RNA sequence: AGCCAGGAUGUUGGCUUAGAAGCAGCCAUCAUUUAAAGAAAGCGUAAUAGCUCACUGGUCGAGUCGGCCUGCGCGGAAGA
């Protein structure tokens, strides 16, 4: 509603292609396509984007705000890309990457390999750092969470994968 | 969590969310303040 | 209690104190220390005077409404907080000195020691008057 | 390299400099020893409170030494030895909570206006007047 | 130290368990004497003229007391001799049938210590026995204060002094005597095995 | 709503004068010192630090906040 009542400042240097309800963008980095909800109306109007209630739907403004947020995320994806940083607290937790299939060494008993989707560059600056970059907020977050879910941090020492910013709620075991 | 037939805000940081119709209390301060069904 | 009526009143109630006395001061909100800015506004109240209003109700529109009747350049208050410290025995007294010397140390920042010069005269500070 | 960053309020009445033995040094975070335990308080702890309450700050700075512009004669001792009645809060609503008068106010105004000052010498005087009056009872002299 | 007369018959110096009898030991050697029926630990053996004492007069205080009973009520003589011999061997392990009622109570220095004692009783001096059932002062690192006191307040424990030294914190607490029953082991798991205490009948 | 930050140095309180700590018991004690000082907010509460009761100044461009009555709904709601 408020966010939907605001123009997307699509800079010059990215391709905008709106059609029906299916939307497509083409920036420096990648290419992003998504069909908005039926209750959303879009228009360019001189180097920007609008989202309003297409008539005959009750949550027109809600769907319009969701679409505004999604289109901004896509614009800034193709503009500057996204980047998720992941850390590995835990003894000998390596995150070696070969090709685009991370080889997570969390030492359960067995090897775990994570097949990334298309659009994720997963380098490992240190032994215990992952840096997923790419041009789609949703898939980068979802793959970072599929990783972190391998070893969610524990409350007692924090062993496991965590986002670089994630504050873990470390707690005391017991009196003993 | 807690499946009390009456969920309430036990702390200040508890929030009432209605995912899937089910009215839940989720608290990002104390995990013992996690309740399920209004 | 910085409501609309209290603003309509305190705009003139704060224009008056700087329109009858000397220039006033303004102090931002960046980092006051347990000793530095606390005891510094203490010594400000001590030496400067017991009439200075270190409070800040310096909204841009309230300023343009109340203060700008005299010295109408008060509505640029988009900058930070104001510690209004006037001076009793003439213009640019110990309060102004302390503010101008605090804008660089002994405080967070004094917002360039704003001051209020009724003249807005040519480019010269009040220093060409020796004996 | 600053003033007290080690605020740990555990120090019995000023007969001895910050008496650890009594209340118990639960505030065991103190890096102070027999080097900084007799440097400045031992030599300037006479004309403030000799057997009265004068709360000591926790200043331990990184000049590799301990020194600062210490506060004035503490109003906590001024209004408890200038009173006669050494009472205060706790039993202020039943009986004498200590003595506080205009004479004690003038005393503290002319005494503790050196370093424990506020928005005036008279304003720290009103500070000492509050530390004397909010005891819960005063002698209306 | 004992002011008595001891004599030698077999002198054995060998590996941990083996025993290679020799004829004499010189200064700087370490050997095992035999038939030495009088000297306790830390007591000085010497010729009729040599030092009355040679330092070493201090070893710790037991921290854990439990009672014990054999399978048959009347093997308590066997048990008392076993626990007099093992007590001779370990000076940090007492035994005294407290004459409050009659109960033969065993004071070691740890739960596993007393396990070792009981299984040595069952194996060497074979008597299968099942074990059973003040102003405290504690030192501990200044990180486990909250839990040790939670533990002390968890027990019927009132406290005396909230004083912290410099390499830790000295806790003082008034707790029952029928209580705590394992306070050393509770404390050791609780304190990261880095605390001592004392509980001598306020 | 979202953003630039500021709470004592009479004050272990004059305190159950064993403090039970600028935010244990505690009485109450703005305590000028103010875009602020409560002798008590979650962190250590028995105690620092670094986020900080409270409060506001600075930002920022149209609505926002809680209640009360009411309709129709939602959970409560498991058996062969």
CA torsion A71→A73→A77→A83, rounded to 10°? -170
Task: State, as a whole number of angstroms, the distance between the CA of C78 and the C1' of F6.
Answer: 18
d(C-alpha E141, C-alpha D125), whole Å: 45
Indicate yes or no: strand F within 7 A of the C-beta of C6.
Answer: no
Residue D1 falls within a domain, yes or no?
no
Q: Which residue's entry shows tokens 């031992």?
A: D42
Please give the C-alpha separations between residue D20 and each of D56, D73, E137, E166, in angstroms, as whole numbers. 12, 22, 18, 12
Mutate to test the interface with D, among E145, E162, E171 (most CBs of D within 10 A): E162
* Helix residue spans in chain E (DSSP H): 76-89, 111-123, 145-154, 183-191
Cβ separation C46–D121 shorter than 8 A: yes
Are residues D78 and D67 part of one domain? no
What is the enclosing helix (H) or strand (E) of D130?
Answer: helix D121-133
Window 67-96 of chain C: CB closer than 7 A to strand F: 77-83
Residue D119 falls within a domain, yes or no?
yes
Given a contact cutoff of 8 angstroms between Cβ atoms, the answer to whether A128 and A88 are in contact is yes
Indicate yes or no: strand F within 7 A of the C-beta of C27.
Answer: yes
Where would I find the beta strands (DSSP E) of chain D?
none
What is the enclosing helix (H) or strand (E) of C13?
Answer: helix C4-20
Are residues D131 and D102 part of one domain? yes
Residue D41 domain boundaries: 7-71
Length of chain A: 176
Task: State, as a whole number of angstroms, the distance between the CA of C33 and the C1' of F27.
Answer: 31
Nearest alpha-carbon partner for A86 in A160, A171, A169, A155 = A160
> Count of domains in chain D?
2
Residue D2 falls within a domain, yes or no?
no
Indicate yes or no: strand F within 7 A of the C-beta of E150.
Answer: no
Q: How far apart are the first and last CA of chain E?
A: 34
Indicate yes or no: strand F within 7 A of the C-beta of B6.
Answer: yes
Of all protein residues, which has its CA closest to the C1' atom of F20? D23
* Rg of chain D taking only CA atoms, in angstroms: 16
d(C-alpha D133, C-alpha D79), whole Å: 9
Are residues D62 and D86 part of one domain? no
Given a contact cutoff of 8 angstroms between Cβ atoms, the answer to whether A79 and A28 are in contact is yes
Method: cryo-EM
Q: What share of chain C is helix, strand, coil (3-state, %, to 5)?
A: 40, 0, 60
Are residues D81 and D54 part of one domain? no
Q: Is any Cβ of chain E less than 8 angstroms from the Cβ of A176?
A: yes
Q: Which residue's entry shows tokens 């512009």?
A: D69
d(C-alpha A114, C-alpha A122), whole Å: 11
Residue D22 falls within a domain, yes or no?
yes
Q: Domain boundary residue among D24, D42, D71?
A: D71
List, edge to edge, every strand of the sheet that includes A121-123: A121-123, A129-134, A82-89, A160-163
Q: What's D8's DSSP letter?
A: -
What is the enclosing helix (H) or strand (E) of C100?
Answer: helix C94-102
d(C-alpha A61, C-alpha A5), whole Å: 9
Of all protein residues, which has its CA closest to the C1' atom of F46? D26
Are residues D120 and D77 part of one domain? yes
Residue D121 falls within a domain, yes or no?
yes
CA torsion C112→C118→C123→C126, rounded to 10°? -80
CATH topology of domain C1-130: Alpha-Beta Plaits (3.30.70)
Resolution (A): 6.5
Q: Which residue's entry shows tokens 């193709």?
A: A78
Nearest alpha-carbon partner for E109 in E139, E65, E148 = E65
Nearest alpha-carbon partner for E143 in D23, B29, D28 = D28
Nearest alpha-carbon partner for C101 in A46, C93, A112 = C93
Indicate yes or no: strand F within 7 A of the C-beta of C44.
Answer: yes
Are residues D101 and D58 part of one domain? no
Q: Is A88 helix (H, G, I), strand (E, B) or coil?
A: strand
D107 phi/psi in degrees, rounded to 5: -55, -55
**From the CB coordinates, do chains A and C have 3 or more pairs under 8 Å?**
no
Given a contact cutoff of 8 angstroms between Cβ atoms, the answer to whether D75 and D127 are in contact is yes
* Helix residue spans in chain A (DSSP H): 60-80, 137-148
Cβ within 8 Å of residue E153, ≥6 positions away: none
Are residues D84 and D64 part of one domain? no
CA distance D29 to chain E (A): 8
Cβ within 8 Å of residue C107, ≥6 positions away: C27, C32, C36, C37, C40
CA angle A154, A156, A157 (to 5 degrees): 80
The token duo for A169 is 């709620």
User: Chains contacting C with at least 3 CB pairs below 8 Å?
Assistant: D
Cβ separation E169–D28 shorter than 8 A: yes
Are residues D116 and D76 part of one domain? yes
Given a contact cutoff of 8 angstroms between Cβ atoms, the answer to whether A89 and A162 are in contact is yes
d(C-alpha A104, C-alpha A102), whole Å: 6
D95: domain CATH number is 1.10.10.250
Q: Is E82 helix (H, G, I), strand (E, B) or coil?
A: helix
D56 CB neighbour count, 10 Å cutoff: 19
D50: domain CATH number is 3.30.1550.10
Residues in A closer than 8 angstroms to E147, CB to CB, are 172, 174-176
Q: Domain boundary residue among D55, D71, D87?
A: D71
- Domains present along chain A, CATH in parentheses: 8-76 (3.90.930.12), 82-163 (3.90.930.12)
Cβ separation C46–D123 shorter than 8 A: yes
């Amino acid at each position: 509603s408020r966010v939907a009542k605001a123009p997307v400042v699509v800079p010059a240097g990215v391709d905008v292609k709106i059609n029906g309800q299916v939307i497509t963008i083409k920036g420096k980095n990648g290419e992003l396509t998504r069909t908005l909800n039926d209750a959303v109306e879009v228009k360019h109007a001189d180097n920007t984007l609008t989202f309003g209630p297409r008539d005959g739907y009750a949550d027109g403004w809600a769907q319009a705000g969701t679409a505004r947020a999604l289109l901004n995320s896509m614009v800034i994806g193709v503009t500057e890309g996204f980047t998720k940083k992941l850390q590995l607290v835990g003894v000998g937790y390596r995150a070696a990457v070969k090709g685009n299939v991370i080889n997570l060494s969390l030492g359960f008993s067995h090897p775990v390999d994570h097949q990334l989707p298309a659009g994720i560059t997963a380098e490992c600056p240190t032994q215990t750092e992952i840096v997923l970059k790419g041009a789609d907020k949703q898939v980068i977050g979802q793959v970072a969470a599929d990783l972190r879910a391998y070893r969610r941090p524990e409350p007692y020492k924090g062993k496991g994968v965590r986002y670089a910013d994630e504050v873990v709620r470390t707690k005391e075991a017991k009196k003993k | 969590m807690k499946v009390r037939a009456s969920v309430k805000k036990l702390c200040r940081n508890c929030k009432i969310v209605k995912r899937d119709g089910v009215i839940r209390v989720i608290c990002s301060a104390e995990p013992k303040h996690k309740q399920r069904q209004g | 209690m910085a409501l609309n009526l209290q603003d309509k009143q305190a705009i003139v109630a704060e224009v008056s104190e700087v329109a009858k006395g000397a220039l006033s001061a303004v102090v931002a909100d960046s980092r006051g220390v347990t000793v530095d800015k606390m005891t510094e506004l203490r010594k400000a109240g001590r030496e400067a005077g017991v009439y200075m209003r270190v409070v800040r109700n310096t909204l841009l529109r309230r300023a343009v409404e109340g203060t700008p009747f005299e010295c109408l350049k008060d509505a640029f208050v988009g900058p930070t907080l104001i510690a209004y410290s006037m001076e009793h025995p003439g213009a640019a007294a110990r309060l102004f000195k302390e503010f101008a010397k605090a804008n660089a140390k002994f405080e967070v920042k004094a917002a360039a020691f704003e001051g209020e010069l009724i003249p807005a005269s040519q480019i010269d500070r009040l220093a060409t008057l020796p004996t | 390299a600053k003033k007290v960053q080690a605020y740990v309020k555990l120090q019995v009445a000023a007969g001895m400099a910050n008496p650890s033995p009594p209340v118990g040094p639960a505030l065991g975070q103190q890096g102070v020893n027999i080097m900084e335990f007799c440097k400045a308080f031992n030599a300037k702890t006479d004309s403030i409170e000799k057997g009265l309450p004068i709360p000591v700050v926790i200043t331990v700075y990184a000049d590799r030494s301990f020194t600062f512009v210490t506060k004035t004669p503490p109003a906590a001792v001024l209004l408890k030895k200038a009173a006669g009645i050494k009472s205060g809060s706790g039993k202020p609503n039943k009986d004498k909570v200590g003595k506080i008068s205009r004479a004690q106010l003038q005393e503290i105004a002319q005494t503790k206006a050196a370093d424990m000052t506020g928005a005036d010498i008279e304003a720290m005087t009103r500070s000492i007047e509050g530390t004397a009056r909010s005891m819960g009872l005063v002698v209306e002299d | 130290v004992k002011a008595a007369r001891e004599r030698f018959g077999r002198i054995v110096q060998m590996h941990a368990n083996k025993r290679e009898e020799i004829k004499e030991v010189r200064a700087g050697d370490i050997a095992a004497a035999i038939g030495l029926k009088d000297v306790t630990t830390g007591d000085t053996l010497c010729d009729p003229d040599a030092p009355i004492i040679l330092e070493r007069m201090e070893f710790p205080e037991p921290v854990i007391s439990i009672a014990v009973e054999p399978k048959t009520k009347a093997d308590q003589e066997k048990m008392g001799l076993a626990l007099g011999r093992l007590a001779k061997e370990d000076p940090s392990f007492r035994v005294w049938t407290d004459e409050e009622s009659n109960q033969t109570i065993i004071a070691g220095m740890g739960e596993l210590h007393l396990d070792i004692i009981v299984d040595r009783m069952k194996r060497e001096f074979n008597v299968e026995a099942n074990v059973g059932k003040m102003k405290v002062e504690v030192e501990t690192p200044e990180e486990n204060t909250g839990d040790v006191i939670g533990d002390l307040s968890r027990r019927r424990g009132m406290l005396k002094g909230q004083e912290s030294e410099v390499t830790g914190v000295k806790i003082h607490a008034e707790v029952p005597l029928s209580e705590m029953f394992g306070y050393a082991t509770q404390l050791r798991s609780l304190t990261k095995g880095r605390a001592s205490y004392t509980m001598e009948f306020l």
